[PDB]
């Protein structure tokens, strides 16, 4: 479709610090690719981001009931909504699946790779550590980082550069809020 | 000092399509959206709807204001249309793939605008729709969108897969391939 498009987009954002001790509320407006005006609860009034938003800064700051609604949002909206879904969002805990498999370097390098795949977990914060004969490996540890699956789950692949010897025991160890004890998967050459 | 969590109410209205969306996002995940055609709240995971509620009428009333605001902003901009930004497309699996153990292909579409796409899943060059699912248009810290499409499948050495993405910023539909390794 070659037809020109026109987009109006808004985000009302609630940023939470130390539970709900401090809340920062942002009411943002975008026309096409441009953020033109916003209300920041720290500021206390609307402010134009660009020239395009100057008429709204002037007009919305003069709308008494609207500005007070925005000023009350941290409690009536942010803190309210935080509490509504708290049990299944903030307190959501989904335990990981830990899979260990060797992988060949392409083309062959001096080392091969040992993959620790940690999947299907929630929240995103995780600790994945490689061990060789009960000693942590800091060198040769490569990760593509935290991958969001878009379905309230995350995954991560943590690789260890290895020179695999006859009787070496490799251990991937996972710590995550969903589990009280470190999870381990052993691999032998 | 860093924030622990973010809750976003994201909404848009788009002309000439006359399409709009209203959704809530928690740390990058869709909690729910409003089905505009059915005038109903659609929960991302069924358990959410057992624990919380949302009146769709409020989203519908906001969408009508978003539409009025689009008309005002379109005139104020001197009728400037959007410049299309094509998406980055990544295809991954939910977990490492094992032969004949069901798995899920994930097509992640990111950093694009306007929020309009046509997404097709291709198995050996053929369209497949069995058990497919998707998110609505998800917010980013910028003016850009993200979206996920899902295809559950039984892994085999024979079958190949493609996620075909159409966007107005793309000269030709973008195909991202996946096939079983070794």
């Amino acid at each position: 479709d070659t037809r020109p498009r026109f987009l109006e987009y808004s985000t009302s954002e609630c940023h939470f610090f130390n539970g709900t001790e401090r809340v920062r509320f942002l009411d943002r407006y975008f026309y096409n690719q441009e953020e033109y005006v916003r209300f920041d609860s720290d500021v206390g009034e609307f402010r134009a981001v660009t020239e395009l938003g100057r008429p709204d800064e002037e007009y919305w700051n003069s709308q008494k009931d609207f500005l007070e609604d925005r000023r009350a949002a941290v409690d009536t909206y942010c803190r309210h909504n935080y509490g509504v879904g708290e049990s299944f969002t903030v307190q959501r805990r989904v335990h990981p699946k830990v899979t260990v498999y060797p992988s060949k370097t392409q083309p062959l390098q001096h080392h091969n790779l040992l993959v620790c795949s940690v999947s299907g977990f929630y929240p995103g914060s995780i600790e994945v550590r490689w061990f060789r004969n009960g000693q942590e490996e800091k060198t040769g540890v490569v990760s593509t980082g935290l991958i969001h699956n878009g379905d309230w789950t995350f995954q991560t692949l943590v690789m260890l550069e290895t020179v695999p010897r006859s009787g070496e025991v490799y251990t991937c160890q996972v710590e995550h809020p969903s589990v009280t004890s470190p999870l381990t998967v052993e691999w032998r050459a | 000092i860093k924030e622990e969590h973010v809750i976003i109410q994201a909404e848009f209205y788009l002309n000439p399509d006359q399409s709009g969306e209203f959704m809530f996002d928690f740390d990058g995940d869709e909690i729910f959206h409003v089905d505009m055609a059915k005038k109903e709240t659609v929960w991302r995971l069924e358990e959410f709807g057992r624990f919380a509620s949302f009146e769709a009428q409020g989203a519908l009333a906001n969408i009508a204001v978003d539409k009025a605001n689009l008309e005002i902003m379109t005139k104020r901009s001197n009728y400037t249309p959007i410049t299309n930004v094509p998406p980055e497309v990544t295809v991954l699996t939910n977990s490492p793939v094992e032969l004949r153990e069901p798995n899920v292909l994930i097509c992640f579409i990111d950093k694009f605008t306007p929020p309009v796409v046509n997404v097709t899943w291709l198995r050996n060059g053929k369209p497949v729709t069995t058990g497919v699912s998707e998110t609505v248009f998800l917010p980013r810290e910028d003016h850009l969108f993200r979206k996920f499409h899902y295809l559950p499948f039984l892994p085999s050495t024979e079958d190949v897969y493609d996620c075909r993405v159409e966007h107005w910023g793309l000269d030709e539909p973008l195909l991202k391939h996946w096939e079983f390794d070794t």
Binding site: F66, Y77, G83, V84 | -
Partner: peptide
């Protein structure tokens, strides 16, 4: 419990 909508307001015409 109900999620609350933050109500939209018409822009300056």
């Amino acid at each position: 419990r109900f999620y609350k909508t933050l109500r939209a307001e018409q822009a300056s015409q």
